[PDB]
Design a protein around this ligand. Structure first.
Ligand SMILES: [Mg+2]
Ligand SMILES: [Mg+2]
Ligand SMILES: [Mg+2]
Ligand SMILES: [Mg+2]
Ligand SMILES: [Mg+2]
Ligand SMILES: [Mg+2]
Lengths: 95, 143, 49, 48, 92, 52, 354, 110
RNA sequence: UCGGAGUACAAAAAACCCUCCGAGUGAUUUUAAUCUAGACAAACCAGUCAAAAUAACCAUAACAUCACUUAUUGAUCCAAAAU
């Protein structure tokens, strides 16, 4: 990660994280299961469902992705017909 | 207001048969490894000794609900050779009539593979069905 | 929020209210460079409007 | 047009589905019967 | 329901015989909506329910189809209690 | 004895394929599978060979 | 570490050595019979019944009822043996049994069952339905005398009320006919009790028809303390139990506290406790007959609630406990995207300040 | 050398919930490779011989008799070869349900 | 690289160029779905179960089965597929 760029001196971001991850405004990150497109004929239906299902990331990976991504991707986003707009926020978090 | 309008919205129904009749009672799902499966509210149990024939309807706790036995004088004095296929059929008819009197209409029967292919108990099941008692106890709502 | 603006006087219903008027009354903020295409209407407080 | 073509093809292929499954079942039965008859003939000629 | 003059008499009678489970003792038919948090959507649902009731009570082509899974038990118990009911002795 | 990986498609007109392991010395593959597009018991026939 | 068993082990009796000289059972049915015979014994280890409610195991039930009929066992056995021998001597019955074409007079079978062993079956089914668990709370009786209750649906339609039957309020709207055998020298009391349906008190039950001082069989000429009230179960909570209890009494009992008025449409007065009733009339009354049936809600209950009782119809529903969910974590690990939907208050988008 | 492939991590086959533990539906009570604990009341059996509670309640462990399925040939043969006084005993895991099925609440007084 | 047994005797885990078995697949038809509570295990990636509800067959089961059944298998990216 480039903490200080050469042209503008800002902090760059890695494109792999934005290509294979999605950040919700609540701080959670969204990702796909590894191996969900490899050798589907060799796997059970339940295993295939688990592979196809979306999963979250814990605190360590979330902090790593936050460090590796710029604050532009942490903004509040109001897309038209956004499927994840309902998941953007958090409710009933007794902490 | 009217003295009779008091409701106490938390109504308690003390009848033990209530949930079984509504088919929302807790069936005893489970074992799977041993036989027979104990997932029922009422079960038919046919005991064929070398002398007498006794058909029980048992609840999941093991108590006897209604029974029809060749040892009973009513069937003994009216029926000859209480071990026959006709004896099994008569016991089944009497048990079906008694179940109709008792208000029970659904029960499970789980015979052995060599018992389901017999002549006496095949006709016993036929008589039980013709008497109004139907097997295959209904599926539990929200099982 | 629209009701809050109107009753605090930031925007006036007597005149036609546009996105310009909302921006002037500080009811909404629009950033065109962030691919924003304007203001949409939701029904969060439609019961007391 | 694509939706209507898809629906038409689905209906046309489903209209012959009982016939296709019956034909497949009869073909499998014929193959099994032929194999059994061949084995029976071989056993009968070898037993004598 | 009996004072509702915007519907036909046969439709009113069909409503009274079909939806008698939700009719108060005073004859006031009552509909309830709970789904949405907005009273506007709740009234939309109530009016849609009323429209469906009016349509099903006004259409004479209704065959009154019923399910089987939840009614097999009722049919079996009705037949079995009728078997005992078949006793025919004069009384009273 | 080497197996064969064969991709079989539905005969219900709808496009629906699935892969199955088969024996090389067997005939053309034809089974009765379940199609979720039409939600029915559908005859599936062999069309393609993917992997040996 | 080894510990000593707290009692005899199950298979410690048979000898391990010389197994070939020990007889075996070759029948799965025989093994099943032996296993079920052993499973009913009170073992010293933690068994299934103790954890799943054998209902306190043995219970010394207080018997409040008439003495059993004293029958000469020797002569009864002799007559039964003679009847069996006479039936066995017939050749046509043997031919029918061999040819599998034989019928039974079910009416006579039912009559004999009621005469000899019907009381015990009725008592055990009343145990199973919990009549004594709510009427006396500690006491079971044997319904020695029969009790045939029948509702009239019309001119030619009669619905019997057997032990555990299902009779609808439409059939039970009118007063039923009760028949039992008794000489013209005794007095009886009939009490119809609703065990379930009291709105306020769970430990209390309703009275529907209480008639006392019945001379012999004639129930109509006996004075009715409480007039008949058609059953009124709730729409939601269904299958209430209604029990006709028949008591035999010696003295001419008169009571002014349990007397009910002719209208008797007040549920406050229609609140009963059979325990206290039998405590009050324990000296003379002794229960001898019992006939209970189930009753659910139908269209006729609304009329009873509205016209007779002058109340609105209460409607119930079988609500289920909410599903259990664990504490929501700040960072769920490997949980599906729908994890946030399990704790959503409502399916409505909420804009806080926008 | 001559001994290869002997390294393999443990599969954590053991007992999860003990007697008196309050569990909910779907909780895995125990996992095993061979049939050590048999499911009893309100305990299912997964295809990998794991035991999971079907109802919410208290876990119990009981010694009970063993009546095998008549279709299981090996167990049937063992049963027929058992002597006249021998009865098989096994350890079963049960769940005693604590939460009632439901309550009759008033909806509307019509 | 993966699985089984002892070391590691009784919840779990536990190493060596420690002592032995194996696995890199075969045969058959019951061709074995979707969705979702709650749990096992685990640094992470991965692996496991699974109640209720829906589509097609008894109008009563479907976990594909067997070979000690446990291992019989490989992540991104990229290439060929064409849904
Ligand atoms: Mg903005
Ligand atoms: Mg005797
Ligand atoms: Mg090892
Ligand atoms: Mg290791
Ligand atoms: Mg854990
Ligand atoms: Mg299911």
């Amino acid at each position: 990660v480039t903490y200080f760029s050469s042209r503008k001196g800002k902090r760059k971001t890695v494109k792999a994280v934005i290509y294979r991850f999605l950040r919700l405004h609540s701080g959670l990150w969204l990702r796909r299961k590894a191996g969900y497109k490899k050798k589907l004929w060799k796997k059970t239906a339940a295993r295939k469902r688990r592979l196809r299902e979306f999963v979250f990331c814990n605190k360590t990976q979330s902090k790593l992705l936050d460090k590796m991504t710029t604050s532009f991707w942490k903004r509040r986003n109001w897309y038209a017909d956004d499927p994840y707009q309902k998941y953007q926020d958090r409710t009933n978090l007794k902490v | 207001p009217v003295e009779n309008e008091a409701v106490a919205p938390e109504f308690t129904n003390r009848n033990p048969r209530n949930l079984e009749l509504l088919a929302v009672a807790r069936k005893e799902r489970g074992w799977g490894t041993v036989w027979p499966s104990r997932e029922f509210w009422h079960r038919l149990r046919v005991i064929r000794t070398q002398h007498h024939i006794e058909a029980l309807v048992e609840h999941r706790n093991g108590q006897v609900v209604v029974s029809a036995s060749t040892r009973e004088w009513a069937i003994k004095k009216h029926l000859y050779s209480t071990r026959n296929v006709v004896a099994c059929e008569s016991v089944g008819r009497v048990l079906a009539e008694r179940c109709l009197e008792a208000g029970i209409n659904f029960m499970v029967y789980h015979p052995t593979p060599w018992e389901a292919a017999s002549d006496s108990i095949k006709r016993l099941q036929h008589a039980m069905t013709e008497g109004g008692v139907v097997l295959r106890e209904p599926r539990r709502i929200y099982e | 929020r629209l009701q809050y603006l109107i009753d605090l006087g930031r925007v006036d219903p007597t005149q036609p209210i546009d996105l310009t008027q909302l921006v002037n009354g500080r009811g909404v903020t629009i950033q065109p460079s962030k691919r924003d295409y304007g203001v949409q209407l939701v029904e969060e407080g439609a019961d007391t409007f | 047009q694509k939706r209507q073509a898809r629906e038409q093809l689905i209906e046309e292929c489903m209209a012959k589905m009982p016939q296709m499954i019956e034909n497949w079942r009869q073909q499998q039965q014929e193959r099994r019967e032929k194999e059994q008859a061949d084995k029976d003939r071989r056993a009968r000629l070898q037993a004598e | 329901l009996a004072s509702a003059d915007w519907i036909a008499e046969p439709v009113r009678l069909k409503l009274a015989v079909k939806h008698k489970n939700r009719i108060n003792r005073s004859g006031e038919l009552i509909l309830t909506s709970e789904c949405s948090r907005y009273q506007f959507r709740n009234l939309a649902d109530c009016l849609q329910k009323l429209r469906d009731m009016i349509a099903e009570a006004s259409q004479p082509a209704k065959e009154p189809s019923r399910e089987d899974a939840e009614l097999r038990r009722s049919r079996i118990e009705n037949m079995n209690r009728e078997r005992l009911r078949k006793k025919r002795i004069s009384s009273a | 004895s080497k197996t064969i990986l064969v991709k079989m498609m539905s005969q219900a007109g709808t496009g629906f394929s699935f892969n199955t392991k088969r024996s090389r010395l067997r005939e053309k593959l034809t089974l009765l599978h379940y199609d979720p597009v039409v939600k029915k018991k559908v005859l599936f026939v062999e069309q393609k060979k993917i992997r040996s | 570490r080894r510990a000593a068993p707290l009692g005899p082990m199950p298979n410690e009796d048979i000898d391990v050595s010389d197994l070939e000289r020990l007889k075996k059972y070759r029948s799965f049915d025989r093994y099943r019979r032996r296993a079920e015979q052993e499973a009913r014994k009170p073992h010293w280890w933690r068994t299934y019944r103790e954890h799943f409610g054998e209902e306190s195991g043995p219970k010394d039930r207080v018997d409040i009822g008439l003495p059993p009929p004293k029958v000469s066992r020797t002569q009864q056995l002799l007559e039964r043996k003679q009847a069996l021998r006479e039936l066995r001597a017939n050749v046509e019955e043997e031919r029918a049994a061999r040819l599998q074409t034989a019928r039974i007079p079910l009416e006579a079978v039912r009559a004999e069952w009621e005469r000899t062993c019907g009381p015990y079956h009725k008592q055990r089914l009343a145990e199973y339905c919990g009549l004594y668990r709510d009427l006396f709370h500690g006491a079971t009786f044997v319904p020695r005398v029969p009790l045939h209750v029948a509702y009239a649906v019309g001119e030619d339609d009669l619905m019997p009320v057997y032990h555990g039957n299902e009779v609808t309020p439409t059939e039970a709207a009118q007063a039923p006919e009760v028949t039992y055998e008794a000489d013209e020298g005794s007095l009886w009391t009939l009490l119809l009790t609703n065990l379930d349906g009291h709105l306020l008190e769970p430990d209390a039950e309703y009275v529907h028809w209480l008639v006392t001082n019945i001379p012999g069989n004639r129930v109509t000429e006996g004075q009715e303390t409480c007039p008949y009230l058609p059953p009124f179960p709730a729409r939601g909570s269904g299958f209430h139990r209604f029990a006709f209890l028949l008591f035999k009494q010696d003295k001419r009992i008169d009571f002014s506290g349990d007397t009910r008025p002719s209208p008797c449409y007040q549920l406050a007065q229609r609140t009963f406790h059979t325990f206290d009733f039998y405590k009050k009339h324990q000296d003379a009354m002794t229960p001898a007959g019992l006939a209970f049936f189930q009753c659910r809600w139908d269209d006729s209950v609304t009329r009873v609630f509205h016209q007779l009782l002058d109340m609105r119809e209460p409607v119930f529903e079988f609500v289920r406990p909410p599903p259990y969910h664990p504490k929501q974590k700040r960072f769920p690990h490997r949980q599906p995207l729908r994890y946030l939907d399990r704790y959503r208050d409502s399916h409505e988008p909420t804009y806080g300040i926008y | 050398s001559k001994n290869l492939g002997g390294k393999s991590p443990g599969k954590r086959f053991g007992i999860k919930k003990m007697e008196g533990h309050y569990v909910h539906a779907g909780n895995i009570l125990a996992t095993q490779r061979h049939f050590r604990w048999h499911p009893g009341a309100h305990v299912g059996l997964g295809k990998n011989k794991c035991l999971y509670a079907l109802e919410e309640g208290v876990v119990r462990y009981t010694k009970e008799v063993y009546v095998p399925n008549p279709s299981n040939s090996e167990a049937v043969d063992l049963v027929t070869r058992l002597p006249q006084g021998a009865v098989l005993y096994k350890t079963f895991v049960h769940v005693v349900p604590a939460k009632p099925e439901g309550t009759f609440k008033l909806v509307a007084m019509l």
